[PDB]
Amino acid sequence: EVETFAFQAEIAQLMSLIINTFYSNKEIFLRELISNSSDALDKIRYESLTDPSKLDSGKELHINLIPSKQDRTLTIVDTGIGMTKADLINNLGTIAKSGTKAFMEALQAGADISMIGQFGVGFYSAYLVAEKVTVITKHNDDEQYAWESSAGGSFTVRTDTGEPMGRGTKVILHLKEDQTEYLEERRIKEIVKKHSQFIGYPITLFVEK
Ligand SMILES: CC(C)(C)C1=NO[C@@H](Cn2cnc3c(Cl)nc(N)nc32)C1
Numbered sequence: 001e002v003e004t005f006a007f008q009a010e011i012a013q014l015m016s017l018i019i020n021t022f023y024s025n026k027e028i029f030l031r032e033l034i035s036n037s038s039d040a041l042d043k044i045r046y047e048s049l050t051d052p053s054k055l056d057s058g059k060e061l062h063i064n065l066i067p068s069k070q071d072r073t074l075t076i077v078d079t080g081i082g083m084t085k086a087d088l089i090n091n092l093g094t095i096a097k098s099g100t101k102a103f104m105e106a107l108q109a110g111a112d113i114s115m116i117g118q119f120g121v122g123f124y125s126a127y128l129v130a131e132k133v134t135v136i137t138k139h140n141d142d143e144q145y146a147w148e149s150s151a152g153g154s155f156t157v158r159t160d161t162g163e164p165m166g167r168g169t170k171v172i173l174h175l176k177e178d179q180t181e182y183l184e185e186r187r188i189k190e191i192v193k194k195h196s197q198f199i200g201y202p203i204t205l206f207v208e209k
Contacts, residue, residue, distance in 0.1 A: 001158065001159075002156050002157075002158045003089075003156060003157050003158065004154055004155075004156050005089060005154060005155055005156070005157065006153060006154055007093070007149075007153055007154065007155060008093055008096075008097055010097050010100045010101055010104075011093060011096060011097065011100055011121075011124070012151075012153045013100075013104070014100045014103070014104065014121060014124055015124055015127055015149075015151045016151070017104070017107075018113070018124055018125060018127045018128060019127050019151055021113065023113045023128070025112075025113070025114055026128040026129050026179070027182075027191045027195075028113070028114045028116070028125055028128070028195070029125040029126050029128050029129050029130075029173075030065075030076075030182070030188070030191050030192070030195065030196070031117070031122075031191070031195035031196050032116065032117050032122030032123065032125045032126075033076045033122075033123065033126065033171055034063060034076065034192070034195075034196045034199060034203065035117060035122060035196075035199075036122065036123060037063045037076060037078035037080055037169070037201075038063070038078075038199050038200065038201060039080070040078055040080025040081045040082070040168070040169060041061045041062075041063070041078055041079065041080040041081075041201050042080075042200075043080065043081040044061070044079075044080055044081040044082075044167070045061060047081070054140055057138075057140055057166045057167035058079050058166040058167050058168070060079055061079055061080075061201055062078070062079055062201055062202045062203075062204065063076070063077065063078050063199070063201050063202070063203045063204070064076075064077040064078075064203075064204050064206060065077075065188055065192070065203065065204070065205045065206060066206040067182075067183040067184075067185070067188070067206065067208055068183070068208070069180075069183050069208055071174075072174065072175050072177075072180060072183070073172050073173060073174055073175065074129075074172075074173045074175060074182050074183060074188075075170055075171065075172045075173070076170070076171040076173075077168065077169075077170045077171075078168050078169055078170075078201075079166070079167060079168040080167075080168050080169060081139060081140075081167070081168075082137045082138045082139035082140070082142075082167050082168050082169055083135075083137040083139055083145070083147075083169060084139045084142040085142055085143070085145055085157065087139070088135075088137070088145055088147045088157050089157055095120065096120060096121050098120075099119035099120035099121045100119070100121050102119050103115075103116060103118075103119035103121060106119070113125070113128075123171075126171065126173055127151060129173060129175055129176060129179040129182055130173040130174050130175055130176065130179075131150060131174055131175070131176050132148065132149070132150040132174040133148070133149060133171065133172065133173055133174065134146060134147070134148045134171075134172040134174070135147040135148070135169060135170070135171050135172070136160055136162065136165065136169070136170040136172070137165075137168070137169040137170070138164070138165045138166065138167050138168060138169075139167070140167060143159055143160075144159070144160040144162075144164060144165060145157055145158065145159060145160055146158050146159075146160040146162075183208070185205060185207060185208070188205055189205060192205065
């Protein structure tokens with residue numbers, strides 16, 4: 001079964017702003033997703049210090065960047081703590097409502113879209129470059145889920161039938177047709193070096209076959 005949900009009005013407004021505002025500096029999406037992965041890796045590492053069994057689903061703590069020219073996707077994979085069903089449907093959106101309102105006000109007060117991560121809603125910068133985002137995620141003691149949205153005010157959640165991940169999150173960016181530069185090894189290297197060079201987990205940039 002696929003369940004369809006309405007975004008909170010403030011998050012739908014944020015997504016429309018990101019999709020519709022003219023802003024050439026689109027590359028900031030990657031730093032935001034890598035930062036989210038780093039935060040999730042921090043969380044499972046910290047929890048493992050008092051409950052080592054939390055790493056039974058995988059001890060490797062890393063970030064993979066995987067381009068696919070054939071699928072026109074850029075995938076950001078981490079082995080962090082992952083998200084529960086309640087995270088996906090309700091609880092992360094509840095936290096994001098406050099940051100969205102703060103971001104939207106700062107925007108009017110002269111802030112830049114690149115400051116989005118300071119408001120805890122950096123994920124939605126993915127819609128600078130993606131027409132659709134699919135998020136596959138697995139938290140210990142919950143099932144593997146697929147979250148998906150092409151914006152337009154709704155998202156879906158379903159139990160994922162694909163390959164099991166163990167633990168963590170995969171953000172699959174279905175790139176807009178004019179945003180395929182973010183499949184180039186060279187371009188991704190440039191962005192990671194510029195924005196993400198001090199992240200405390202190995203970032204592997206996969207090469208296309
Ligand atoms: C609900 C949805 C749109 C999918 C997000 N809201 O929060 C986002 C940022 N975020 C929160 N928890 C995260 C974990 Cl555990 N990992 C990673 N990579 N990102 C995480 C994602």
